Design an enzyme around this catalytic site. Sequence first.
Site, mmCIF file in Angstrom:
data_model
loop_
_atom_site.group_PDB
_atom_site.id
_atom_site.type_symbol
_atom_site.label_atom_id
_atom_site.label_comp_id
_atom_site.label_asym_id
_atom_site.label_seq_id
_atom_site.Cartn_x
_atom_site.Cartn_y
_atom_site.Cartn_z
ATOM 1 N N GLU A 41 35.893 -42.822 -17.588
ATOM 2 C CA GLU A 41 35.430 -44.140 -18.000
ATOM 3 C C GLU A 41 34.632 -44.825 -16.897
ATOM 4 O OE1 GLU A 41 37.132 -46.862 -16.250
ATOM 5 O OE2 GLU A 41 37.863 -45.112 -15.141
ATOM 6 N N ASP A 99 37.004 -43.838 -27.749
ATOM 7 C CA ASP A 99 35.723 -43.141 -27.737
ATOM 8 C C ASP A 99 34.611 -44.001 -28.327
ATOM 9 O OD1 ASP A 99 37.463 -41.237 -26.846
ATOM 10 O OD2 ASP A 99 36.775 -39.641 -28.179
ATOM 11 N N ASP A 135 0.838 -1.195 0.000
ATOM 12 C CA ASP A 135 0.000 0.000 0.000
ATOM 13 C C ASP A 135 0.876 1.249 0.000
ATOM 14 O OD1 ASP A 135 -2.083 1.799 0.152
ATOM 15 O OD2 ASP A 135 -2.613 1.354 2.233
HETATM 16 N N1 LIG Z 1 39.269 -42.588 -25.558
HETATM 17 C C1 LIG Z 1 38.854 -41.963 -24.326
HETATM 18 N N2 LIG Z 1 39.485 -42.431 -23.097
HETATM 19 C C2 LIG Z 1 39.128 -41.855 -21.771
HETATM 20 C C3 LIG Z 1 38.203 -40.869 -21.627
HETATM 21 N N3 LIG Z 1 38.114 -40.577 -20.314
HETATM 22 C C4 LIG Z 1 38.990 -41.389 -19.634
HETATM 23 N N4 LIG Z 1 39.580 -42.151 -20.583
HETATM 24 C C5 LIG Z 1 40.387 -42.895 -19.831
HETATM 25 O O1 LIG Z 1 40.177 -42.996 -18.321
HETATM 26 C C6 LIG Z 1 41.374 -43.326 -18.002
HETATM 27 C C7 LIG Z 1 41.699 -43.185 -16.525
HETATM 28 O O2 LIG Z 1 42.319 -44.377 -16.059
HETATM 29 P P1 LIG Z 1 41.406 -45.634 -15.474
HETATM 30 O O3 LIG Z 1 40.558 -46.147 -16.611
HETATM 31 O O4 LIG Z 1 40.530 -45.159 -14.320
HETATM 32 O O5 LIG Z 1 42.312 -46.938 -15.023
HETATM 33 P P2 LIG Z 1 41.883 -48.454 -15.558
HETATM 34 O O6 LIG Z 1 42.095 -48.479 -17.058
HETATM 35 O O7 LIG Z 1 42.645 -49.583 -14.894
HETATM 36 O O8 LIG Z 1 40.430 -48.707 -15.225
HETATM 37 C C8 LIG Z 1 42.372 -42.323 -18.889
HETATM 38 O O9 LIG Z 1 43.807 -42.787 -18.852
HETATM 39 P P3 LIG Z 1 44.957 -42.066 -19.852
HETATM 40 O O10 LIG Z 1 45.247 -43.021 -20.987
HETATM 41 O O11 LIG Z 1 46.245 -41.778 -19.109
HETATM 42 O O12 LIG Z 1 44.316 -40.672 -20.512
HETATM 43 P P4 LIG Z 1 44.208 -40.440 -22.159
HETATM 44 O O13 LIG Z 1 45.581 -40.108 -22.713
HETATM 45 O O14 LIG Z 1 43.714 -41.735 -22.771
HETATM 46 O O15 LIG Z 1 43.259 -39.302 -22.499
HETATM 47 C C9 LIG Z 1 41.886 -42.373 -20.008
HETATM 48 O O16 LIG Z 1 42.575 -43.405 -20.859
HETATM 49 C C10 LIG Z 1 37.537 -40.373 -22.926
HETATM 50 O O17 LIG Z 1 36.715 -39.508 -22.877
HETATM 51 N N5 LIG Z 1 37.868 -40.916 -24.229
HETATM 52 MG MG LIG Z 2 38.738 -47.906 -15.222
HETATM 53 MG MG LIG Z 3 -3.871 3.112 3.605
#
Ligand SMILES: Nc1nc2c(ncn2[C@@H]2O[C@H](COP(=O)(O)OP(=O)(O)O)[C@@H](OP(=O)(O)OP(=O)(O)O)[C@H]2O)c(=O)[nH]1
Ligand SMILES: [Mg+2]
Ligand SMILES: [Mg+2]
Lengths: 439, 447
Positions: free
Chosen positions: B363, B337, B51
């Site tokens: 992953e 991927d 008001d």
């Molecule tokens: N192709 C792909 N791979 C992924 C992605 N996100 C994670 N990764 C994987 O997750 C991995 C992390 O290691 P972990 O997966 O937890 O260990 P683990 O193999 O024994 O289970 C990265 O290791 P890294 O090899 O040291 O990293 P990077 O060089 O492969 O990117 C990477 O390879 C993604 O979006 N695309």
């Molecule tokens: Mg793993």
């Molecule tokens: Mg009033």
Amino acid sequence: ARILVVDDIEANVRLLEAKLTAEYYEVSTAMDGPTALAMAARDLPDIILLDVMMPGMDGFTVCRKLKDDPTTRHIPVVLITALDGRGDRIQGLESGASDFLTKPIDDVMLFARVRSLTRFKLVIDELRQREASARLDGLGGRVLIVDDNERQAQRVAAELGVEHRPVIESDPEKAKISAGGPVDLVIVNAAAKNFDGLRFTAALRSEERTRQLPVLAMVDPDDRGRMVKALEIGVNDILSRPIDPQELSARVKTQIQRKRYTDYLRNNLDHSLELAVTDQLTGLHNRRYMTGQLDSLVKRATLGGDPVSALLIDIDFFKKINDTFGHDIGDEVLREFALRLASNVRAIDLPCRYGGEEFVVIMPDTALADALRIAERIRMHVSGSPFTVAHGREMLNVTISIGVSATAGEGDTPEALLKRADEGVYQAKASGRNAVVGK
Amino acid sequence: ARILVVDDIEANVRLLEAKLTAEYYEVSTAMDGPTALAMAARDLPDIILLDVMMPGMDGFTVCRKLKDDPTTRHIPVVLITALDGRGDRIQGLESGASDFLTKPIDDVMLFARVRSLTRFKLVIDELRQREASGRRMGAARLDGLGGRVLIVDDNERQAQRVAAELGVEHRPVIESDPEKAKISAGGPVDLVIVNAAAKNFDGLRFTAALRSEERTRQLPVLAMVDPDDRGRMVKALEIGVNDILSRPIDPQELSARVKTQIQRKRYTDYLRNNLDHSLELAVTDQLTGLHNRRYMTGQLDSLVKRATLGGDPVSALLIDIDFFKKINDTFGHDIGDEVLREFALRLASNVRAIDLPCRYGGEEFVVIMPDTALADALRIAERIRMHVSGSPFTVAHGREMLNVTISIGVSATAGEGDTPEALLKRADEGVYQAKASGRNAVVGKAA
Ligand SMILES: Nc1nc2c(ncn2[C@@H]2O[C@H](COP(=O)(O)OP(=O)(O)O)[C@@H](OP(=O)(O)OP(=O)(O)O)[C@H]2O)c(=O)[nH]1
Ligand SMILES: [Mg+2]
Ligand SMILES: [Mg+2]
Ligand SMILES: Nc1nc2c(ncn2[C@@H]2O[C@@H]3COP(=O)(O)O[C@H]4[C@@H](O)[C@H](n5cnc6c(=O)[nH]c(N)nc65)O[C@@H]4COP(=O)(O)O[C@H]3[C@H]2O)c(=O)[nH]1
Ligand SMILES: Nc1nc2c(ncn2[C@@H]2O[C@@H]3COP(=O)(O)O[C@H]4[C@@H](O)[C@H](n5cnc6c(=O)[nH]c(N)nc65)O[C@@H]4COP(=O)(O)O[C@H]3[C@H]2O)c(=O)[nH]1
Ligand SMILES: Nc1nc2c(ncn2[C@@H]2O[C@@H]3COP(=O)(O)O[C@H]4[C@@H](O)[C@H](n5cnc6c(=O)[nH]c(N)nc65)O[C@@H]4COP(=O)(O)O[C@H]3[C@H]2O)c(=O)[nH]1
Ligand SMILES: Nc1nc2c(ncn2[C@@H]2O[C@@H]3COP(=O)(O)O[C@H]4[C@@H](O)[C@H](n5cnc6c(=O)[nH]c(N)nc65)O[C@@H]4COP(=O)(O)O[C@H]3[C@H]2O)c(=O)[nH]1
Ligand SMILES: Nc1nc2c(ncn2[C@@H]2O[C@H](COP(=O)(O)OP(=O)(O)O)[C@@H](OP(=O)(O)OP(=O)(O)O)[C@H]2O)c(=O)[nH]1
Ligand SMILES: [Mg+2]
Ligand SMILES: [Mg+2]
């Protein structure tokens, strides 16, 4: 929205046409199967209202033939049945009907169904366009039944238990919390005893978390006032009591499928990089945004009115900036340039990033003569002041070439308008730099 | 939505409280300035109905003090004026009022304003949350001025007067033909002002056409209405006009309502085009197509809260792919991927659509299973493991085959004081123990 009405009796058709046209719908009519099928393929309507009982070709056959044609398969079909149409609705679902109305036509139920299915048609149309350039059926959803009538809720849950994942909630407080989680549909009892189902629904619509959650209201058909009140509060559609299994199936499928279409278009595809509308570096809009807006702008200009102007700005010798100062400093210049450009043009204008180092400014309700003087104003503000880069360590001068065009003519097009501005830029680049050219 | 009503006379307050509570609003009341300012800062309502004339501290002072406090500055304030309240509305805008109501209070106008400003309050709240997040983590036009306003009216004298009133702060454009107006409305238009009582066209039919097209479905629309015709006012609001303007048009009312619609649009467009497409606010993983952790956290919060009140528990599966580095090492990051995309399809296919299979980490994946007990969750994890490990993964456009194994940790929400964090921490322990005792195993942790 365009509706096709089909009935063998002319008086029924004229009555519906009058009611729907009064509510601002564009209505076409057909009085037999063959003509309705020809009209649907030719005009491609948004909704078809179809009588089940017609001499020669019944509505079920028309429905089946509508789904056979790939060009009309997507158009929602509503079957108008009689009072005791349990068998009709069963055969209607087999024929591919979207939903049902029962005669004599209840105006509240008529417009409730039409409004629901027209909104569904919008998402259907959008999804088909993007598919031309992920669970998308209406089954398997988590449906939340908010009802204190145990016998009713259990019956509804049993009917829904073969195609969906139903869950019952008698307490409205617990229901509010569950409704904020992974819920696809809420079925609330408008005629509840221990809580106001309509107040409950209004609470859902007030919170942003649940504002667009689909809600179906179970209503008593005697109480027309509560039916209208529920639709006003924002219920998606209503179910008359006692609950018909085929009506329940159809209406739930429509709401769940509409939700999945919307979420898929907005969460996945809109966030994809091919469909983006804003440049991440400069913060301006891109060509995709500009093309959509320019289409309507040019169409209006062709009908006789204030024209549309187009400015194409290209930075001169941008390679040398990257060569001398690096690519990161080049990115600094583009961001600062975009800020200067938008600051010195109207917010009603469209300063967009057209190419890599090329920018566009669309200026609605603007003539060529002014556009040329505006380009001169822009050039002096961007070229008159140096660009400070490298956290203040370096200063750099920039010059730009501009090409200008305007929409004069009855058959002008967005492409022709921009092609004329391209020539402006190319001629401005050829005859030295830091000039404006109008074609 | 919570509304604060402020009037010195108790009968006025009870009348409004009754009307608003009947429309499912949560209403608080104050009967003087000091009390209203204390209540506003304490409860932070969504809208304040105020008001103008109160003994001691008038509404204008209360409005000014509400905008001085930074904690209440954002709350829209509606001033209740008198009939000839031109001076009230002029002084109201100077005090910082959002909009106005005129006495005697018209129920149609009352709920139109409240509905309009509650929707604006929703976007205000969202923008402030995002700004809070940006502050913890470390340049668009967000006022209501300078908009392109499209006046659709055949009354020349009215349209010219409206355009003149709007010509100082906005960019007005007049359209007599409704066909041409339909096209212009699809371009860069911030607001449409249509004349409901037009002579050569049905402005309400025009408005319904705008709302039917997806291009213009959410374009803000103001309708100029005759106060004599109550039926046309309600019809316009039913069709979906954002708010209404009584004729003859008040300059201060026109200014207020236009600013409200334009600023609401700019808030919405900024929140949906800019911030929603940023990586911090996304809810879907672009690679796999699943939802991400942001989405999962929101949903799990409600799921656990309901479980703590007594009911069916919530289960959580944490899936981690074994030896994913070796995949990237042997076949490359692009094939890695491909494996993630194919894994997401298998995971989603073998759980219910009501479940939440999300990409939790790089992953690592999470499956939230509502209304599910631990004993079943363990058997579901066994189903998942057999489907991913029983069949090889086809990659490299069909040229290469690869085997994959996963470690799973399982937990369920048992208890009244359980929390989402504890639920996931118990699943983490499952995964870590599953990794330690070999690979390709499932481990459950109950509280
Ligand atoms: N192709 C792909 N791979 C992924 C992605 N996100 C994670 N990764 C994987 O997750 C991995 C992390 O290691 P972990 O997966 O937890 O260990 P683990 O193999 O024994 O289970 C990265 O290791 P890294 O090899 O040291 O990293 P990077 O060089 O492969 O990117 C990477 O390879 C993604 O979006 N695309
Ligand atoms: Mg793993
Ligand atoms: Mg009033
Ligand atoms: N889309 C677009 N068109 C532009 C722009 N700048 C000029 N024009 C067009 O050119 C006309 C003349 O503008 P002006 O010569 O600079 O002479 C202008 C200008 O001096 C002033 N004005 C209007 N708006 C602004 C503004 O936003 N900032 C400033 N500094 N002056 C303005 O008022 C004069 C008359 O303006 P108008 O009657 O509206 O008619 C304007 C307008 O139609 C622009 O940035 N974007
Ligand atoms: N020479 C010239 N330059 C123009 C014109 N229109 C826009 N500009 C330039 O572009 C800037 C942004 O104008 P805006 O985005 O519409 O945002 C403007 C606009 O909303 C408003 N404004 C200023 N003058 C006017 C006016 O004359 N009429 C209207 N309707 N608004 C104005 O104030 C805002 C800031 O304006 P500015 O600070 O001056 O800075 C303006 C001005 O430098 C024009 O017609 N002529
Ligand atoms: N959130 C979630 N919970 C799961 C899942 N799998 C099993 N459960 C839970 O565990 C209960 C027993 O499932 P079942 O032993 O395989 O015994 C089930 C199963 O044999 C069958 N069933 C239900 N839905 C399906 C389905 O979608 N596909 C198949 N092939 N069978 C199903 O009906 C039996 C009873 O199922 P319910 O009464 O609903 O009660 C189920 C359910 O609550 C799952 O993937 N996601
Ligand atoms: N209300 C209900 N709907 C049923 C039933 N059986 C099949 N469906 C429906 O049919 C869809 C495919 O199930 P599926 O082929 O067996 O393939 C299923 C199944 O393999 C597995 N699954 C889901 N729930 C269960 C379960 O309870 N027990 C078992 N053993 N598997 C389940 O996940 C797949 C996807 O299930 P959804 O995503 O929900 O999608 C399911 C569900 O919508 C049922 O008994 N009751
Ligand atoms: N810093 C930065 N530069 C951009 C961007 N988009 C284009 N560039 C660059 O602009 C440069 C073209 O500038 P101009 O020399 O004026 O091109 P023009 O002849 O068509 O007028 C190219 O140089 P370039 O050295 O080949 O750049 P790039 O290929 O390394 O990206 C091009 O790649 C951007 O977003 N950021
Ligand atoms: Mg018949
Ligand atoms: Mg260049």
